[PDB]
Ubiquitin-like-specific protease 1 (Saccharomyces cerevisiae), 219 residues
Amino acid sequence: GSLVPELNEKDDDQVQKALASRETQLMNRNIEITVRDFKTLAPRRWLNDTIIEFFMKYIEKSTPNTVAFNSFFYTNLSERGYQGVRRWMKRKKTQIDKLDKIFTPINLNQSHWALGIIDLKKKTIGYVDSLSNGPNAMSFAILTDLQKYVMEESKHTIGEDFDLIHLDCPQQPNGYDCGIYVCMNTLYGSADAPLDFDYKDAIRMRRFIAHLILTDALK
C-alpha cells in the first residue's frame, strides 16, 4: 500500500493557493500556522519547528498509546536534564508505562533534523538520521539522554536495559529535506512499518502535511 497519500486535484490546488497567498493565520488549534510557516513546506525549503510540532501532534492524535514531543523537548532535556522536562509527560494526559512509543524530533546545531524513537514494547531507543555519516558523539549523547529520560520519567522502573541503536533509514538526496524525512520516519515508525520509503514518497509528504494543515487535521 502506502502511508503518504496522493492528493486529489482540488486538495493539491488548495495548497498551491495557500503557498502563492500573501496572507497571519492558516491554522490555530495551540499551534498557529501562518503562510510564512506553511511556506517552509514549499519545495526545496527548510521545514520549521512549527510544522514539525504540527505533524508530531498529528501523529499523536492519529496513533494509539503514542507521544510525539515537539523539538523543544530534546533541547530542554539536553541543556537542563530531566528536571527541565519533568512535567512534559503529565501534560500529555498519560504515563510512560502506558505507552508503546515516544517520538522525539531533534534539531542538531539548529539545522540538521534527526529523530529519536523510544519503543517501550520493543525496549529500544533508536537514533534515525537521513543525513547520517554513522555513529558519532552527538548521536551517542541523544541516545544517552533519551534513556536517562525514560529512567527518570518511569521513577526507575524501566529503560536501564534498553537497546541503544542507530536505525538505518532512507538517506536524502539533498541537504534540505531533513525535516520531511523525520516526518517520514515518524509516520512509518508509528505504523510499525519498515523504513523503506523513497525520495518520491518524501516529496508527497510535503503536500500531505500542507493538506493536513489546511483541513484542520488536529480537530
About this structure: The domain at 8-63+169-215 is CATH 1.10.418.20 (Actin-binding Protein, T-fimbrin; domain 1).
